[PDB]
Amino acid sequence: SMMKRVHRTDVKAEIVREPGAKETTHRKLIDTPDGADRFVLTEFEVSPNGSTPPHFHEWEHEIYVLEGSMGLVLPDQGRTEEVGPGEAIFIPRGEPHGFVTGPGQTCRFLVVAPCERPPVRNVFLSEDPYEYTQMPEYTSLLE
Amino acid sequence: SMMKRVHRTDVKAEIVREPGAKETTHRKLIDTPDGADRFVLTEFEVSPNGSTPPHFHEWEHEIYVLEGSMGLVLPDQGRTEEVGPGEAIFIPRGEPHGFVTGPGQTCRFLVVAPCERPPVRNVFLSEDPYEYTQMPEYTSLLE
Ligand SMILES: [Zn+2]
Ligand SMILES: [Zn+2]
């Protein structure tokens, strides 16, 4: 394969596919079509009033926060930790996590993932994939 | 295992170990001691008048340029390509590459690498590991 270089703005931002995510887009910067065969690099952005359903999975995250701030929701620690620019975050396999932003709050961050990514498990189970945002158990993690 | 969060400034910048590198430091942000067992995240900074010996190795790079600019030296393409902020770069296994900065030029960039990193091979072989900087074959890459 060949050396690839791409600027972030030349990768189209698409809405994330995870059901029940709000105001969250991503740009796949380096992926398996580029010859990456073990890990990949994706940029995410959570716009104001955004969230993803807290989940857990058998693939680790390494995260680097580029711009803005957001809440890292940590259901097994009963809390949400604010993260900001210049922070690296490792989330091991199995550890529940989700993202959130309030009004006026935007966050752009890199996620490094493996090529093989088994399906995620939701912390809050429901037919409606948005129901987590109205559950007391979730809202209490936000403080 | 456990979730780790670290701001870049809480990881001490150290000179890179590669012989013949100049003005190049790194901060290991997420590494194997943190429970990372497939890939790791390192921030590098090349300060002005800096360079690394062009090399090749059996491990791919995924790189994201955070601040400033530098030359990606590409020996198999007979050229040096200027890179800047917001750029993702993929460098396959075996492709030669090095970094360089001129007098007013500093660059801070993330490198994602595997845990297993066999020894690199220098493009320019010499006993003095700085000898590349004065070789015509190298300086003509810089164009
Ligand atoms: Zn996840
Ligand atoms: Zn290298």
Side-chain angles (χ1 to χ4, degrees):
Chain A
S1 79
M2 60 189 262
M3 184 279 287
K4 150 169 180 187
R5 182 263 292 268
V6 71
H7 183 89
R8 61 175 295 278
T9 63
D10 298 321
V11 175
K12 188 170 187 183
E14 307 283 3
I15 303 158
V16 310
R17 289 180 27 168
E18 194 174 19
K22 323 203 293 259
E23 311 295 319
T24 306
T25 51
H26 69 321
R27 301 172 195 261
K28 290 173 186 292
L29 305 172
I30 298 165
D31 198 11
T32 66
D34 309 305
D37 62 340
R38 306 195 271 175
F39 45 91
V40 305
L41 185 70
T42 304
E43 186 179 280
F44 290 80
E45 183 159 35
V46 181
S47 282
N49 306 304
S51 62
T52 61
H55 67 205
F56 59 105
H57 41 80
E58 292 300 292
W59 44 283
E60 62 276 28
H61 290 302
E62 301 178 8
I63 293 172
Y64 188 96
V65 179
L66 298 168
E67 186 60 72
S69 62
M70 63 183 173
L72 180 50
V73 182
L74 298 159
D76 280 359
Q77 303 189 359
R79 74 195 188 94
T80 301
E81 177 71 62
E82 183 178 16
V83 298
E87 298 172 19
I89 299 156
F90 178 69
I91 308 172
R93 292 192 286 279
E95 181 72 31
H97 59 278
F99 303 108
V100 72
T101 57
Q105 188 182 36
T106 300
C107 191
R108 187 191 305 158
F109 60 96
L110 295 173
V111 171
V112 179
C115 288
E116 296 305 334
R117 296 189 294 278
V120 315
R121 294 181 71 185
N122 288 337
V123 172
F124 304 100
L125 300 169
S126 67
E127 256 195 303
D128 173 3
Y130 292 92
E131 196 169 293
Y132 72 99
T133 61
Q134 66 185 63
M135 294 177 200
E137 298 86 347
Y138 175 75
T139 58
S140 73
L141 298 178
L142 304 175
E143 322 311 352
Chain B
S1 48
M2 79 179 210
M3 188 285 294
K4 152 171 182 180
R5 184 268 292 281
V6 72
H7 185 84
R8 52 178 301 278
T9 64
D10 299 328
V11 185
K12 192 171 190 168
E14 300 286 4
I15 312 163
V16 304
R17 301 207 321 175
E18 195 174 20
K22 318 204 298 246
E23 310 296 324
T24 309
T25 58
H26 69 310
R27 302 173 201 257
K28 290 177 177 299
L29 301 175
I30 305 178
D31 196 9
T32 53
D34 304 310
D37 65 353
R38 299 190 271 184
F39 49 86
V40 303
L41 183 65
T42 308
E43 187 177 287
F44 291 80
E45 192 159 347
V46 182
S47 286
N49 302 304
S51 66
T52 65
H55 64 205
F56 59 103
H57 38 81
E58 289 298 299
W59 46 279
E60 62 274 23
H61 289 307
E62 299 177 13
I63 292 164
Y64 186 99
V65 182
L66 298 166
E67 173 85 42
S69 67
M70 68 184 171
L72 172 50
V73 184
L74 301 168
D76 283 354
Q77 296 182 8
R79 73 202 189 81
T80 299
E81 181 154 281
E82 181 178 331
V83 296
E87 300 180 18
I89 300 161
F90 172 69
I91 304 175
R93 291 191 288 277
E95 185 65 20
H97 60 274
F99 304 101
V100 63
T101 60
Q105 204 183 22
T106 295
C107 193
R108 180 171 39 229
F109 60 98
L110 293 168
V111 168
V112 185
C115 290
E116 289 310 323
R117 299 192 293 284
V120 308
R121 295 178 68 188
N122 293 331
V123 170
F124 304 102
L125 304 175
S126 61
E127 221 186 351
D128 176 358
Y130 294 92
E131 199 175 280
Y132 69 99
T133 60
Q134 68 180 65
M135 293 181 190
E137 298 80 6
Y138 175 73
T139 59
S140 71
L141 304 181
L142 300 191
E143 309 140 85

PDB file of all heavy atoms in Angstrom, chain B residues 90-110:
ATOM      1  N   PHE B  90      -0.901   8.313   7.068  1.00  0.00           N
ATOM      2  CA  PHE B  90      -0.684   6.868   7.225  1.00  0.00           C
ATOM      3  C   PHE B  90       0.600   6.480   6.492  1.00  0.00           C
ATOM      4  O   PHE B  90       0.768   6.821   5.325  1.00  0.00           O
ATOM      5  CB  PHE B  90      -1.845   6.063   6.652  1.00  0.00           C
ATOM      6  CG  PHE B  90      -1.591   4.578   6.620  1.00  0.00           C
ATOM      7  CD1 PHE B  90      -1.515   3.855   7.785  1.00  0.00           C
ATOM      8  CD2 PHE B  90      -1.424   3.902   5.416  1.00  0.00           C
ATOM      9  CE1 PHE B  90      -1.284   2.474   7.771  1.00  0.00           C
ATOM     10  CE2 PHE B  90      -1.188   2.525   5.398  1.00  0.00           C
ATOM     11  CZ  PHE B  90      -1.120   1.823   6.589  1.00  0.00           C
ATOM     12  N   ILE B  91       1.513   5.809   7.187  1.00  0.00           N
ATOM     13  CA  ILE B  91       2.769   5.363   6.590  1.00  0.00           C
ATOM     14  C   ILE B  91       2.868   3.846   6.749  1.00  0.00           C
ATOM     15  O   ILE B  91       3.111   3.361   7.846  1.00  0.00           O
ATOM     16  CB  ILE B  91       4.001   6.013   7.241  1.00  0.00           C
ATOM     17  CG1 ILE B  91       3.900   7.533   7.176  1.00  0.00           C
ATOM     18  CG2 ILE B  91       5.300   5.482   6.554  1.00  0.00           C
ATOM     19  CD1 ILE B  91       5.041   8.283   7.904  1.00  0.00           C
ATOM     20  N   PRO B  92       2.679   3.099   5.655  1.00  0.00           N
ATOM     21  CA  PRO B  92       2.671   1.648   5.773  1.00  0.00           C
ATOM     22  C   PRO B  92       3.978   1.057   6.259  1.00  0.00           C
ATOM     23  O   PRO B  92       5.042   1.715   6.199  1.00  0.00           O
ATOM     24  CB  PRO B  92       2.376   1.162   4.339  1.00  0.00           C
ATOM     25  CG  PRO B  92       2.648   2.272   3.462  1.00  0.00           C
ATOM     26  CD  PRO B  92       2.516   3.547   4.260  1.00  0.00           C
ATOM     27  N   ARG B  93       3.886  -0.179   6.733  1.00  0.00           N
ATOM     28  CA  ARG B  93       5.075  -0.994   7.021  1.00  0.00           C
ATOM     29  C   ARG B  93       6.069  -0.984   5.854  1.00  0.00           C
ATOM     30  O   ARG B  93       5.696  -1.244   4.719  1.00  0.00           O
ATOM     31  CB  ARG B  93       4.666  -2.435   7.342  1.00  0.00           C
ATOM     32  CG  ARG B  93       3.928  -2.579   8.688  1.00  0.00           C
ATOM     33  CD  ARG B  93       3.779  -4.028   9.095  1.00  0.00           C
ATOM     34  NE  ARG B  93       2.797  -4.695   8.252  1.00  0.00           N
ATOM     35  CZ  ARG B  93       1.477  -4.653   8.429  1.00  0.00           C
ATOM     36  NH1 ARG B  93       0.936  -3.976   9.436  1.00  0.00           N
ATOM     37  NH2 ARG B  93       0.689  -5.307   7.578  1.00  0.00           N
ATOM     38  N   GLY B  94       7.327  -0.632   6.136  1.00  0.00           N
ATOM     39  CA  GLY B  94       8.390  -0.702   5.141  1.00  0.00           C
ATOM     40  C   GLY B  94       8.688   0.573   4.377  1.00  0.00           C
ATOM     41  O   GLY B  94       9.736   0.669   3.743  1.00  0.00           O
ATOM     42  N   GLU B  95       7.772   1.540   4.400  1.00  0.00           N
ATOM     43  CA  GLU B  95       7.963   2.767   3.648  1.00  0.00           C
ATOM     44  C   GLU B  95       8.944   3.679   4.393  1.00  0.00           C
ATOM     45  O   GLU B  95       8.700   4.021   5.554  1.00  0.00           O
ATOM     46  CB  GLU B  95       6.627   3.506   3.433  1.00  0.00           C
ATOM     47  CG  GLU B  95       6.723   4.753   2.533  1.00  0.00           C
ATOM     48  CD  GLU B  95       7.117   4.436   1.092  1.00  0.00           C
ATOM     49  OE1 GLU B  95       6.950   3.270   0.658  1.00  0.00           O
ATOM     50  OE2 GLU B  95       7.596   5.355   0.384  1.00  0.00           O
ATOM     51  N   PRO B  96      10.047   4.078   3.743  1.00  0.00           N
ATOM     52  CA  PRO B  96      10.985   5.014   4.403  1.00  0.00           C
ATOM     53  C   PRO B  96      10.408   6.420   4.690  1.00  0.00           C
ATOM     54  O   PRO B  96       9.563   6.932   3.946  1.00  0.00           O
ATOM     55  CB  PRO B  96      12.151   5.110   3.417  1.00  0.00           C
ATOM     56  CG  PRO B  96      12.021   3.945   2.536  1.00  0.00           C
ATOM     57  CD  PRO B  96      10.566   3.635   2.436  1.00  0.00           C
ATOM     58  N   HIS B  97      10.869   7.021   5.779  1.00  0.00           N
ATOM     59  CA  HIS B  97      10.323   8.302   6.235  1.00  0.00           C
ATOM     60  C   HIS B  97      11.176   8.890   7.343  1.00  0.00           C
ATOM     61  O   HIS B  97      11.795   8.172   8.114  1.00  0.00           O
ATOM     62  CB  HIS B  97       8.894   8.113   6.761  1.00  0.00           C
ATOM     63  CG  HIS B  97       8.814   7.166   7.909  1.00  0.00           C
ATOM     64  ND1 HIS B  97       8.693   5.801   7.743  1.00  0.00           N
ATOM     65  CD2 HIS B  97       8.869   7.380   9.244  1.00  0.00           C
ATOM     66  CE1 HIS B  97       8.666   5.220   8.927  1.00  0.00           C
ATOM     67  NE2 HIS B  97       8.786   6.153   9.855  1.00  0.00           N
ATOM     68  N   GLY B  98      11.189  10.213   7.403  1.00  0.00           N
ATOM     69  CA  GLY B  98      11.883  10.951   8.439  1.00  0.00           C
ATOM     70  C   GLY B  98      11.227  12.294   8.570  1.00  0.00           C
ATOM     71  O   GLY B  98      10.372  12.647   7.761  1.00  0.00           O
ATOM     72  N   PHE B  99      11.615  13.035   9.600  1.00  0.00           N
ATOM     73  CA  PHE B  99      11.013  14.343   9.883  1.00  0.00           C
ATOM     74  C   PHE B  99      12.099  15.392   9.864  1.00  0.00           C
ATOM     75  O   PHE B  99      13.257  15.086  10.127  1.00  0.00           O
ATOM     76  CB  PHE B  99      10.281  14.316  11.238  1.00  0.00           C
ATOM     77  CG  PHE B  99       9.230  13.234  11.323  1.00  0.00           C
ATOM     78  CD1 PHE B  99       9.488  12.046  11.995  1.00  0.00           C
ATOM     79  CD2 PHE B  99       8.009  13.390  10.700  1.00  0.00           C
ATOM     80  CE1 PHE B  99       8.552  11.053  12.043  1.00  0.00           C
ATOM     81  CE2 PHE B  99       7.055  12.387  10.752  1.00  0.00           C
ATOM     82  CZ  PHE B  99       7.326  11.226  11.419  1.00  0.00           C
ATOM     83  N   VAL B 100      11.726  16.617   9.515  1.00  0.00           N
ATOM     84  CA  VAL B 100      12.668  17.714   9.485  1.00  0.00           C
ATOM     85  C   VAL B 100      11.948  19.052   9.667  1.00  0.00           C
ATOM     86  O   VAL B 100      10.792  19.243   9.233  1.00  0.00           O
ATOM     87  CB  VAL B 100      13.470  17.689   8.141  1.00  0.00           C
ATOM     88  CG1 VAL B 100      12.527  17.905   6.937  1.00  0.00           C
ATOM     89  CG2 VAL B 100      14.600  18.722   8.128  1.00  0.00           C
ATOM     90  N   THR B 101      12.625  19.981  10.320  1.00  0.00           N
ATOM     91  CA  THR B 101      12.112  21.348  10.466  1.00  0.00           C
ATOM     92  C   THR B 101      13.269  22.330  10.233  1.00  0.00           C
ATOM     93  O   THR B 101      14.446  22.034  10.568  1.00  0.00           O
ATOM     94  CB  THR B 101      11.512  21.607  11.877  1.00  0.00           C
ATOM     95  OG1 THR B 101      12.529  21.406  12.866  1.00  0.00           O
ATOM     96  CG2 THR B 101      10.307  20.688  12.173  1.00  0.00           C
ATOM     97  N   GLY B 102      12.935  23.471   9.638  1.00  0.00           N
ATOM     98  CA  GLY B 102      13.910  24.527   9.362  1.00  0.00           C
ATOM     99  C   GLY B 102      13.989  25.463  10.549  1.00  0.00           C
ATOM    100  O   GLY B 102      13.465  25.155  11.610  1.00  0.00           O
ATOM    101  N   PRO B 103      14.646  26.623  10.380  1.00  0.00           N
ATOM    102  CA  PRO B 103      14.866  27.579  11.497  1.00  0.00           C
ATOM    103  C   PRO B 103      13.654  28.197  12.223  1.00  0.00           C
ATOM    104  O   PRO B 103      13.755  28.547  13.398  1.00  0.00           O
ATOM    105  CB  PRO B 103      15.702  28.696  10.846  1.00  0.00           C
ATOM    106  CG  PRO B 103      16.382  28.043   9.705  1.00  0.00           C
ATOM    107  CD  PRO B 103      15.384  27.027   9.175  1.00  0.00           C
ATOM    108  N   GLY B 104      12.538  28.392  11.573  1.00  0.00           N
ATOM    109  CA  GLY B 104      11.416  29.060  12.287  1.00  0.00           C
ATOM    110  C   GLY B 104      10.270  28.113  12.565  1.00  0.00           C
ATOM    111  O   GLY B 104       9.152  28.532  12.838  1.00  0.00           O
ATOM    112  N   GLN B 105      10.578  26.825  12.536  1.00  0.00           N
ATOM    113  CA  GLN B 105       9.560  25.803  12.327  1.00  0.00           C
ATOM    114  C   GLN B 105       9.557  24.801  13.462  1.00  0.00           C
ATOM    115  O   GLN B 105      10.565  24.152  13.711  1.00  0.00           O
ATOM    116  CB  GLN B 105       9.856  25.107  11.009  1.00  0.00           C
ATOM    117  CG  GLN B 105       8.663  24.452  10.365  1.00  0.00           C
ATOM    118  CD  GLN B 105       9.014  23.715   9.101  1.00  0.00           C
ATOM    119  OE1 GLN B 105      10.168  23.325   8.883  1.00  0.00           O
ATOM    120  NE2 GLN B 105       8.008  23.491   8.264  1.00  0.00           N
ATOM    121  N   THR B 106       8.420  24.698  14.160  1.00  0.00           N
ATOM    122  CA  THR B 106       8.197  23.698  15.214  1.00  0.00           C
ATOM    123  C   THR B 106       6.920  22.918  14.916  1.00  0.00           C
ATOM    124  O   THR B 106       5.978  23.477  14.359  1.00  0.00           O
ATOM    125  CB  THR B 106       8.062  24.363  16.601  1.00  0.00           C
ATOM    126  OG1 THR B 106       9.302  24.976  16.960  1.00  0.00           O
ATOM    127  CG2 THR B 106       7.731  23.353  17.663  1.00  0.00           C
ATOM    128  N   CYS B 107       6.889  21.637  15.284  1.00  0.00           N
ATOM    129  CA  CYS B 107       5.726  20.775  15.003  1.00  0.00           C
ATOM    130  C   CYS B 107       5.462  19.830  16.171  1.00  0.00           C
ATOM    131  O   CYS B 107       6.389  19.169  16.654  1.00  0.00           O
ATOM    132  CB  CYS B 107       5.944  19.955  13.723  1.00  0.00           C
ATOM    133  SG  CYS B 107       4.417  19.132  13.080  1.00  0.00           S
ATOM    134  N   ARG B 108       4.203  19.779  16.609  1.00  0.00           N
ATOM    135  CA  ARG B 108       3.734  18.857  17.649  1.00  0.00           C
ATOM    136  C   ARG B 108       2.714  17.941  16.971  1.00  0.00           C
ATOM    137  O   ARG B 108       1.804  18.418  16.277  1.00  0.00           O
ATOM    138  CB  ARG B 108       3.116  19.639  18.813  1.00  0.00           C
ATOM    139  CG  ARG B 108       2.580  18.803  19.974  1.00  0.00           C
ATOM    140  CD  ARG B 108       2.189  19.670  21.180  1.00  0.00           C
ATOM    141  NE  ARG B 108       1.546  20.912  20.776  1.00  0.00           N
ATOM    142  CZ  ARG B 108       1.875  22.119  21.230  1.00  0.00           C
ATOM    143  NH1 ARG B 108       2.825  22.258  22.133  1.00  0.00           N
ATOM    144  NH2 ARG B 108       1.238  23.202  20.788  1.00  0.00           N
ATOM    145  N   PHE B 109       2.921  16.629  17.086  1.00  0.00           N
ATOM    146  CA  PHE B 109       2.082  15.639  16.395  1.00  0.00           C
ATOM    147  C   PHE B 109       1.962  14.338  17.163  1.00  0.00           C
ATOM    148  O   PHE B 109       2.902  13.915  17.847  1.00  0.00           O
ATOM    149  CB  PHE B 109       2.599  15.365  14.961  1.00  0.00           C
ATOM    150  CG  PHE B 109       4.029  14.823  14.890  1.00  0.00           C
ATOM    151  CD1 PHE B 109       4.263  13.462  14.750  1.00  0.00           C
ATOM    152  CD2 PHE B 109       5.124  15.688  14.966  1.00  0.00           C
ATOM    153  CE1 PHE B 109       5.566  12.955  14.658  1.00  0.00           C
ATOM    154  CE2 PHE B 109       6.441  15.191  14.881  1.00  0.00           C
ATOM    155  CZ  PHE B 109       6.659  13.822  14.726  1.00  0.00           C
ATOM    156  N   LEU B 110       0.813  13.695  17.017  1.00  0.00           N
ATOM    157  CA  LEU B 110       0.541  12.419  17.651  1.00  0.00           C
ATOM    158  C   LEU B 110       0.950  11.273  16.756  1.00  0.00           C
ATOM    159  O   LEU B 110       0.760  11.339  15.548  1.00  0.00           O
ATOM    160  CB  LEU B 110      -0.958  12.296  17.933  1.00  0.00           C
ATOM    161  CG  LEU B 110      -1.518  13.257  18.973  1.00  0.00           C
ATOM    162  CD1 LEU B 110      -3.050  13.227  18.924  1.00  0.00           C
ATOM    163  CD2 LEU B 110      -1.004  12.894  20.363  1.00  0.00           C
TER     164      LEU B 110
END
